[PDB]
Amino acid sequence: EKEEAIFRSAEMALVQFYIPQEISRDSAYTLGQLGLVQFRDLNSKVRAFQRTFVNEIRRLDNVERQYRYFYSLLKKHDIKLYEGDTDKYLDGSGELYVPPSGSVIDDYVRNASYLEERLIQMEDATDQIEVQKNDLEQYRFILQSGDEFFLKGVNYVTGVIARDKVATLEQILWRVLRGNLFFKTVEIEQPVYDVKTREYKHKNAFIVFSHGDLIIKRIRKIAESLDANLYDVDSSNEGRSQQLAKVNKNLSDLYTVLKTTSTTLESELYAIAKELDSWFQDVTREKAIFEILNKSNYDTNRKILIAEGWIPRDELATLQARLGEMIARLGIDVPSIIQVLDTNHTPPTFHRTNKFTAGFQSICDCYGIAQYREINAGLPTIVTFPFMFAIMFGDMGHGFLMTLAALSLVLNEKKINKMKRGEIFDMAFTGRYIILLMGVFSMYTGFLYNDIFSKTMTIFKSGWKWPDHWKKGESITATSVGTYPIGLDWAWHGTENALLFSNSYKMKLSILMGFIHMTYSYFFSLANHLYFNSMIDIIGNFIPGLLFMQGIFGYLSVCIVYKWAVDWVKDGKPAPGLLNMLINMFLSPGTIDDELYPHQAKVQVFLLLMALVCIPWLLLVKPLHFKFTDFGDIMIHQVIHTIEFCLNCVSHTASYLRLWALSLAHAQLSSVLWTMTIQIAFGFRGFVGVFMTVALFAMWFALTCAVLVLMEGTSAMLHSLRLHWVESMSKFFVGEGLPYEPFAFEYKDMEVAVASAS
Amino acid sequence: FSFSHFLYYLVLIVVIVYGLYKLFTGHGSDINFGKFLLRTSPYMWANLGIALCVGLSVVGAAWGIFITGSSMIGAGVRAPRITTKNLISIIFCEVVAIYGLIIAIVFSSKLTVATAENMYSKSNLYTGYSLFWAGITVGASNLICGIAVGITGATAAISDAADSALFVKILVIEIFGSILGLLGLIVGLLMAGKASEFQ
Amino acid sequence: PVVSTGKAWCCTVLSAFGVVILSVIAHLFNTNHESFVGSINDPEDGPAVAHTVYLAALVYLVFFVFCGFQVYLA
Amino acid sequence: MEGVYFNIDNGFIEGVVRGYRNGLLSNNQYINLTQCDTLEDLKLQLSSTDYGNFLSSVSSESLTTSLIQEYASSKLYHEFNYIRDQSSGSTRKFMDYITYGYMIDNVALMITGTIHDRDKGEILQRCHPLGWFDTLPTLSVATDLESLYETVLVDTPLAPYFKNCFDTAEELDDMNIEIIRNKLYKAYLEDFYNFVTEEIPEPAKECMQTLLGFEADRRSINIALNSLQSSDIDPDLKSDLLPNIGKLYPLATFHLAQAQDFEGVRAALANVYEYRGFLETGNLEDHFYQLEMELCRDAFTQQFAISTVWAWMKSKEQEVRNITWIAECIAQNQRERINNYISVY
Known part of the structure; x- marks a missing residue:
């Protein structure tokens, strides 16, 4: 029996731990193997070096x-780390492993401290060889150059310099030799690997002829x-051949010395590279234990550590069971180390997720x-987010392709949650049910728009009837022989005024759906204020805002539905303009050009004065009730809340x-894509x-899958997200709290x- | 040097010499600015009004959006919790283009087709003038409002990235600066209030 | 002939959609629907374009059965 | 106005430099650094700031004051090089002009070390890695100042600054190099002032003009207080070392150029209002550091300005100097004068 905590938060407890010192290290492992206690910092206002357990961190x-x-x-010296796959003897069922005890940690410390300087001197030994491999090898390149490198009018210098500095060399030596330089360079093709730095350093040779000694x-x-490495090369050919024969059998001797000096180091690294990850996991866990014991009060008169922690109420029966199992593993007698505390702090939030309500x-x-205990906004988001996506993405076939893309990810869940992916496939996989619901609701919406691949359906009989006869090229009209049951009629397909109906249709659809969404999200504020015993917030904030925005903008929705319900041609009355009368309700009150319902000359004035009187009734009751029980801060904050709540009615x-x-533009771009490419190939x-x-x-197909599903789905997806972050959760969602995030054990990567x- | 000032001075000299010459002949009323307003089609003024309205509103929106977006992206490197908070400073710059949309939807219901007879009547010339000036009024007001709200949004993003307690006190200035586009909206609806269709 | 596995799915999936889509469009050309040919524009004949769209569906079918056995080898 | 066309290129740079600015140490953090006993406590206390995990992977026993100032300076230099890489146009130029003033100090240091026959590699380190200019280690050859200039300095961006330096034509010693370097820095400050006056926009223009004014005034007072050592200097040969910029040039560098004793300098600075609070009290350098930090603090109140880069650069350098002083007082057991750091935030 555990509460669900998806409508609201979960109920919390603050529990004070009376942990003896001799079992404290051992008890923090059991407190960490169950991941459901969040510890608060009791050692505040104590500096980071003055705390207890600091040398056990160092x-x-x-x-x-x-x-x-x-x-x-x-x-370096590429060896794959082993990554011992059994991350299950620490995790998993049982929830109980014996921690390594003391001497194992001292073995880890002295093993690593013995191993480090050994590896340092083995690495330093094999890098004194590379720095004398390098100069011998580039000197061997210098010794094979023919005569054309050594013949232009000891009388020269010769070296190897990086390619980035040859122009600087010749600029300086032209300004120094005054114009009598005989500089010459040939390139080394392969990069020459550096040891003192790590640049690959394209280099080349040079030679500069001159006469004298200064x-x-x-x-x-x-x-x-x-930074040029200069050498000595004989002028004759035979001296160069003697030097080239001398550098060989010295450089080959360096080849023989390099092996079985860079081999024992490598075999030591093969020994270390296996069973290093387990060492690392044990030391990270041991460090986290002392980081949790650091924030507990230390007593000196008795050796008792005092720690506090937040916990949900359904696990006070789990604490006593697990700690009883711990005190049954080792034989002691401690007096009741758990005590539930009565507090006034702010507890964490903790909504439960269960794999479907997790992504939302x-x-x-x-x-x-x-x-804490506010109404969760992730519960209505589950269905109100893919539907507001679906209104903008009203196509049968594109929602069908989106469902196929979603079922390619939902039908193998077990194969995918064991791989390493990176940042794009992560957002693809953690929101697979979002994509599934978006595709199914887009199927329903695209059915109601009568739109599949920018084509119609013809699955019922039409409500419009064409005339009996016409010449090829006559502009005719249809005669309205009934109404169409589900969706738009298929007699609006070509028709050369389809936008004139569809725009005024779907604009009113969007206004009605937006008003129903806002007035549904606004009642969560009433369900909040009724729960926190906050009866002044109802009379000061709920009723003024409800009357102010219903009497302005729900009256417009009632007028839209009423204009739909009334036949204007049969009654012989002119159909009014709802936008015109909405403007003239505020900008010229009392005057009506076309009448909608009989006594509306007075209802406009009454609703206008009620929305007027809700402005001084707001910004007045909530501060002046605090006055008779002004402060300045409540008054100015209430003025800001009034000037912000109003003017967001109109804007939202x-x-x-x-x-x-987005519905209009998705339909138009898909229609132009159908008439642009595949319509050509029909004659x-x-x-x-x-x-x-x-x-x-x-x-x-490549265009309708690339630019028209993937690139317009991401847009409308984050538009359905803006419509919930700004327009919907500015009416009930209060804001700041501290997340749950308990102390738990994890793999460390x-x-x-x-x-x-x- | 300074080619644009040379163009401006050349246009000024040519206009002064031309008007002074039309005096010189004795035909100073041939430059007839009023007869140009009669004999010009009112649908030109109406469509320039609608198009320049929505264009200038979108330009002001884009201006404010990248001003606050550059500073919010730059300030979110060290403190990445400013993005979901100062989303509202981009909301305030995006509603400007929606005000331009509302004006375009209101004004485009008055673009009917008139007869060749009484084409240049009093009501049709009134409608063209009203739609032109109302469109550019709300468009220029939307441009200026988007610029100002974007500047205040960039400064609010920097101040909230300093510490969390400052954005409530700087968001008030964005509430002040965002009413000006609504003023332009109201007066643009009021200038074209009594204008009829084209009949 | 280097790898030829990451491009097998890109053609099998394309052909699997193509067979079904051009088959249903050719069936809608054949029976005169008055929305594919119901105006003075692009087609006039009727089943004479249903002919070549069923031909293209057959060509997509042989694309599908060719590339669907090359992915089978992995 | 200033917020209109600025962000197009510089909005990201400005936001990142303000984010760097928010990690400047305040007074309570310096007091917590003062209360440390050993040097590992100083490491652990610095770990909980914007610095943190900067002395990670060093040692627990090879920790030295010199190593701490090396790494705290290298973090500064990598952040400056990042911000300099992310810029273009006038901001790239402006940051190159920030670099040239350290290039001048590296020139003077390399020549001075070349006179005393020191090693190339000894002078190549402790040689301020921000002012690099690739042909810098070639300054260790050919002692004569001409044979430096006609060979390597003409291709550097310090070439237009030696228009005064060719008066004496002999081998150099320690006073000639300082006369040279003062002429360099004079011509340098006036080049950079005339750069800011013509290209940088206005709210950054006035802030950079007053910061360059203070740089010129500090160096003028230092040259006037160092020139009364054991030599004979013509006021014509000393007034070519005081820059023509600042709030004490139109007439107050004249009395600095014509002054013999310390009381002459006191009477020279007696009429400039911001000054003559300095010479009648203790450490005369700490007053310049305190006034520089107050001016740099006043530069962070303008938002659409690239004075923020210069102000943050100087503030972070003062921060590194403070942490070095506190680390010296901790490591040498000299806690009597540990509270002489300069903290304005």
């Missing part, structure tokens, strides 16, 4: 730092000041974490024209027409933690 994150150095050393020291200092909860929590009900907007008799309609259907440090 030792453990020194071990963390040495593991980070190890894993940085694993990426000139060669001059050119030599200028050259090696720009993650939607609504992206805006703000709700107040104007903002629901987007439901009309093309021959063998060329077969390939023509093949290629043009391929182009049409090493390479994220290395990027988190560096």
Whole structure:
């Protein structure tokens, strides 16, 4: 028996823990293996170095730092980390593993501290060889150049410099040798890997001829000041061949010394790379235990740690069971370490999710974490979010393709929740039921719009009747022989005034749906104020806003439905304009051009003065009741709430024209796409027409899947999200609270933690 | 140098010499600005009004949107909790284009077809003038309101990224600056209040 | 012939939609629906375009049965 | 106005630099740094600020005051290089002009170390990595100032600044290099002032003009207080070292140029209102640091301005100087003068 906590939050408790010192380390593991206690910080106003359990943090994150150095050393000399797949002897059923006890942690500390300096000297030994591999190899490149590199009028310097500095060399040596330079360079094609830095460093050779002795020291200092490695090469061919024979059997000796010096290091890294992840998990868990014990009061007269924590009420029977199992594992006698405390703090929120209400909860929590026991806004979002999507996405076939794309993700849930994906397929997979509901509601909406691939259906008999005879080219009209049962009539398809009906149709649809959404979301404020015993908020905020916005904007909706209900041609009365009379209700009161219902000259004035008198009745009762029980802050905040609640009636009900907007534009772009590509290939008799309609259907399907489902679905999806974040949750959603996020044990994912440090 | 000032000075000199020459002949009333207003089609003035209305409203909206969006993106690097909070500063710049939409929908119901007889009547010329000036009134007011609300939104995003307690005190200034587009909306509805259709 | 697996699904799925869609459009050309040919524009003959749209559906069918066995090999 | 065309290129840069600005240390954080006992406590206390996980992966026993100032300066320099990479047009130029003033100091340091026959690699470190200019280690050859200039300095952006420096034509010692460097920095400040006057928009223009005014005035008072050492200097040969910008040039650099004793400098600064509060009291350098930090604080009240980059740069440098002073007082057990940091926020 657990409460559901999807309409409101879950009921909380504050529990004070009386933990003895000798079982404190052990008890925090049991408190962490059940992930349902959020600890509050009792050691506030105490500096981070003055707290207890700080050397037990310094030792453990020194071990963390040495593991980070190890894993940085694993990426060089490419060895895959083992990643022991059994993340189930710590997780899973049972909820009980024995923690490693003391000597295992000391073994981890001294093992890592012994292993670090060993790896440091083994890495430093094999990098003194690479820095003398490099100069010998580039000197071997210098020794094979022929004569054309060494013949232009010791009388020269020779070196290898990076390619970025050759122009700087020749600029300086032209300004220094005054114009008598014989600079010459040939490129080294492969990059030359650096050890002191990590740049790959495209290099090349050079040679500079001159005569004298103060000139060669001059050119030599200028050259090696720009980080050039200079050498000595004989002028004759035979001396160059003797030097090339001398560098070989020295460089091959370095090849033999490099092996079995960079081999024992690598075998040590093969030993470390297996069973490093388990070390890392154990040390991270041990560090988290002391981070939780850091925020508890320490007593000196007796060795008792005092800790507080938030918890939902249905787990006070779980605490006593798990802690009783712990005190039955080790033989002691402690006096009742659990005590439920009576408090005045603010508890966490904690809505329960169960795999269908989870994605919509993650939607609504992206805006703000709700107040404690406030009405959750993720419960109506489940159906009001894909439907407001569907009004903008009113197509049969596009919602059908969206359902197929959703069922490709829903029908294999078990295969996908065990993979590593990255940031796009994540948003695809965690919202698969959102996409399923969006596709099904878009099927229903596109059925009611009579639109499949921008074509009609003809599944019932029409309500319009064409004339009996006409010449080919006569503009005729239809004669209204009844009404059409479900959807728009298919006699509006070509008809050359289809937009003239459809626009005034769907605009009124959008205004009516937006008003019903706003006046449904506004009653959650009444259900809040009735629950928190806040009877001044009802009489001060609910009734003024209800009367003010109903008497202006619900009267418009009643007039829209009433204008639909009345036959104006049979009665012989002129049909009025609802937009005109809405403007003239405020900008010229009392005067009516076309009459809608008999006594409306007085109802306009009555509703205008009621919406007027709701302006001083708001901004007055809620402050002046606080006065007789003004302050300034309540008064100015209530003036801001009045000037913000009003002028959002007009703005928010104007903002629901987007439901009309995106629907009209989706229909028009899909119609132009149908008449632009595949409509061309219908009058093309021959063998060329077969390939023509093949290629043009391929182009049409690629466009209607790329630009018309994926790129207009994301837009209307975040439009249905704006209509809930701004227009809907500004009427009941109070705002700030603190999220639940209990202390629990998790897998840690090493390479994220290395990027988190560096 | 300064080619635009050279163009402006050249146009000024040519206009002064031309008007002074039309005096010089004794035919100063041939520059007849009033007869140009009679003999010009009223549908031109009406459609320039509607098109320039929706265009200037959208330009002011886009201006405010990127001013507050650049600063909110820049300020959200260290404090990424400002985005869902200061979404409302982009709401306030987006409602400007919706006001332009409402004006275009109201004005486009008056574009009927007139007869060749009584084409340039009193009511038709009145309707063209009213729709033109009402459209550019609400469009320029929407432009200016979008610019101002965008500037205040950028400054509010920076101040809320400082600490959380400041955006309630700076959002009040956006509430002040967002009423000006509604003033332009009301007076644009009132200027074309008594204008009939084209008949 | 390097990999040829990530492009097999892109053609099998395309052909699987293409067979069904051009088959139902050709069936709607054949019986004169008065919404595909019900005006003075693009088609006039009727089943003479239903002919080549069923031909294109057959060509999509042989695309589908060719590429549907190359994905079978993985 | 100023908020209209600014954000088009500089709105992201301005927002990121304000986000960097919100991590400046306030007074309570410096007091918490003061209350540390050992140096590992200072590391753990700095870890809970905008700095944090900056001395991670160093050591627990190789922690030294010099290492802390190296890494706290390198974080500053990487943030400045990021902001300089993300800019274009006039802002890119403006940040290059910020770099040139440290390039001048690297020139003077490399020449001075070349005179005393020191190593290239010793002078290549402690040589302020922001003012780099690739041909910098070539300044260690050919002692004569001409044979520096006709070879390597003409291709640097410091080339238009030696228009005065060719008066003496001999080998250099420690006073000639300082006369040279003062002429460099004079011509430099006037180049950058005439840059700000003609291109930078107005609310940033006035803020950069008053900050450059204070830079010129501080260096004028320092040259006037350092020139009365054991030498004979013509007032014509000293007034070519005081910049023609600031609030004490139109007539108050004249009495600085014609002054013999300390009382002459006191009587010279006696009429400028912001000054003559400085020479009658203690540490004369801390008054310049305090007034610079107050001017930089006043630069953060303008929003659509690229004075924010200069103000944040100088504030973060003062912050690094304060953390270095506190770390020295902790590590040397000299807690008597630990509260002499300069904190304005």
